Design a protein around this ligand. Structure first.
Ligand SMILES: O=c1ccn([C@@H]2O[C@H](COP(=O)(O)OP(=O)(O)O)[C@@H](O)[C@H]2O)c(=O)[nH]1
Length: 534
């Protein structure tokens, strides 16, 4: 009865709860709490309402969100797998179920869910998440469709600020928006670049628009003093847009992209004359408000340009910068790392959702064919590790040859690579920041460059480093090269010594050179839009 009132408030938080004071009510109150970040409670409420209606998908989905946001991953799963049974044709639910299964390495009916979602993307319905879709075996064409759809909806609900232009007066003001400034891939990849730019391109005024508070990391601090860092974490999308506009940013970069907060509306409001997509979301934004994408000759080749909605820009070398100031400490012994003191250590520290059936089979094939080797993986959420040991076994490999490392603070995690002999990349979503973490350490990465940007990032690093032999043609060749390198320790040792040379000889880790190319690109870009210099 009085219920319909409560709902509308979502679009007054406490005025709503006031209404819910009166079931599909236990559920609504539960949803109120979930809005109030009080996840623990919201899960208790929805858990109740779900027992009172174990066949009401509206409630099962809502309970799932709460359980997830309350850190109860495994249980949250069953919640979505249930909201799926009770409403098999709703793609929105299928999309979410699929994404959570991947993260847990639950591959039951994987191909069928994947098909439904890709199909949903093609019908333009289902509102599937672009970042989540990167884990699917979809082509660059499918990805573009997925992105546009999300972009066009956002574009519809927003009225752009008053139009402006690049100054033509200079200094040029370049802005960067991210939720990752410090102890997150984004900050980790750009610190050395910003420090280099501050020192080598004083003419270029760097502005960082952080949508996350200070986390106490050295990275956040370094970024803060290597640019003008604005903490706009508390502003809404409009205020944030007006704030960037208030600073007269000429070239604005989206370092959040789809997924990871991102604040998509902030960019839709077009607060800056020129907006660039770079280094955050490894795909096309497919958005009307995004002018350019910054890739490179390898990861974003001509044959791929058609799928990018924005105009393609390329840097001379690889598109990805890196923190070249990181000292790689010594890890604990192999034993203290749960690793056999003898034998070849093959590793893949990628996020669990990048660990699909195909990639896992690939890695296991190497173990099965090379005795005494082990697979060092990054421990996943829920019971992912358990499912993986199981799969390994079902694949003919002693499940005990898989060693799982817990997520560690960057410095400590970085040091673990010294025990690695070869990094095995995943497909179709490569290791990106993880790929360069390994290379920086001196650990070679083996990859199978695909046909989508996200499936060619590790390849771009290898290419630009000079290690083209590590960019093989397919799974068969992938297993071959691994087994070859694994079987002959003289070769492995030779490959490590070779990476160490190319590392120092190649531009890939020369941030001073990157700062110049990048700066040169920013000025040319500005001049193309009216800037005259000074
Ligand atoms: O034990 C670990 C494992 C990973 N990472 C970092 O976690 C982030 C991984 O993010 P993600 O997998 O999302 O990024 P990508 O590989 O796609 O660039 C990277 O900064 C890794 O350096 C870490 O600090 N400790």
């Amino acid at each position: 009865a009085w219920l319909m009132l409560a709902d509308a408030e979502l679009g007054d938080t406490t005025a709503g709860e006031m209404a819910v004071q009166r079931p599909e009510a236990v559920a609504r109150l539960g949803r109120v709490r979930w809005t109030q970040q009080r996840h623990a409670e919201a899960a208790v409420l929805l858990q109740q309402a779900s027992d009172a209606a174990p066949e009401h998908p509206g409630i099962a989905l809502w309970l799932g969100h709460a359980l997830e946001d309350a850190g109860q991953a495994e249980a949250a799963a069953a919640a979505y797998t249930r909201a799926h049974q009770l409403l098999p044709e709703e793609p929105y639910i299928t999309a979410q179920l699929l994404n959570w299964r991947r993260r847990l390495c639950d591959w039951r009916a994987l191909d069928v869910l994947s098909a439904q979602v890709r199909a949903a993307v093609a019908q333009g319905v289902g509102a599937v998440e672009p970042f989540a879709f990167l884990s699917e075996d979809a082509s660059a064409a499918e990805q573009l469709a997925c992105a546009r759809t999300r972009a066009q909806a956002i574009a519809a609900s927003v009225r752009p600020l008053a139009p402006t232009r690049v100054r033509s007066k200079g200094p040029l003001r370049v802005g960067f928006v991210s939720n990752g400034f410090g102890a997150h891939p984004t900050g980790l990849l750009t610190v050395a670049l910003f420090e280099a730019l501050q020192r080598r391109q004083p003419d270029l005024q760097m502005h960082l628009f952080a949508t996350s508070g200070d986390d106490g990391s050295t990275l956040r601090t370094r970024l803060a003093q290597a640019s003008t860092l604005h903490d706009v974490t508390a502003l809404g999308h409009l205020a944030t847009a007006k704030h960037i506009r208030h600073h007269g940013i000429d070239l604005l970069f989206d370092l959040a992209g789809w997924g990871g907060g991102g604040r998509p509306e902030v960019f839709a409001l077009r607060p800056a004359p020129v907006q660039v997509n770079w280094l955050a979301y490894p795909g096309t934004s497919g958005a009307p408000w995004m002018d350019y994408v910054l890739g490179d000759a390898f990861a974003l080749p001509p044959a791929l340009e058609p799928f990018y909605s924005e105009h393609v820009l390329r840097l001379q070398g690889a598109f990805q910068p890196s923190d070249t100031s990181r000292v790689v400490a010594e890890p604990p012994s192999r034993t203290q790392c749960g690793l056999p003191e003898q034998g070849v250590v093959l590793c893949c520290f990628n996020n669990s959702y990048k660990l699909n059936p195909q990639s896992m089979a690939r890695m296991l094939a190497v173990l099965r064919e090379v005795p005494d080797s082990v697979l060092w993986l990054l421990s996943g959420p829920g019971e992912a590790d358990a499912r993986l040991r199981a799969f390994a076994h079902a694949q003919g490999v002693d499940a005990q040859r898989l060693v799982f490392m817990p997520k560690l603070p960057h410095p400590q995690y970085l040091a673990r690579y010294r025990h690695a002999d070869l990094f095995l990349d995943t497909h179709p979503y490569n290791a990106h920041t993880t790929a360069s973490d390994a290379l920086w350490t001196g650990c070679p990465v083996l990859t199978t460059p695909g046909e989508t940007f996200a499936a060619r990032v590790a390849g771009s690093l290898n290419h630009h480093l000079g290690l083209d032999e590590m960019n093989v043609a397919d799974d068969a060749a992938f297993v071959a090269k691994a087994v070859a390198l694994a079987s002959d320790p003289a070769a492995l040792t030779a490959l490590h010594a070779r990476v160490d040379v190319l590392r120092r000889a190649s531009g890939v880790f020369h941030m001073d050179g990157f700062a110049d190319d990048f700066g040169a690109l920013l000025q040319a870009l500005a001049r193309r839009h009216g800037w005259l210099g000074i």
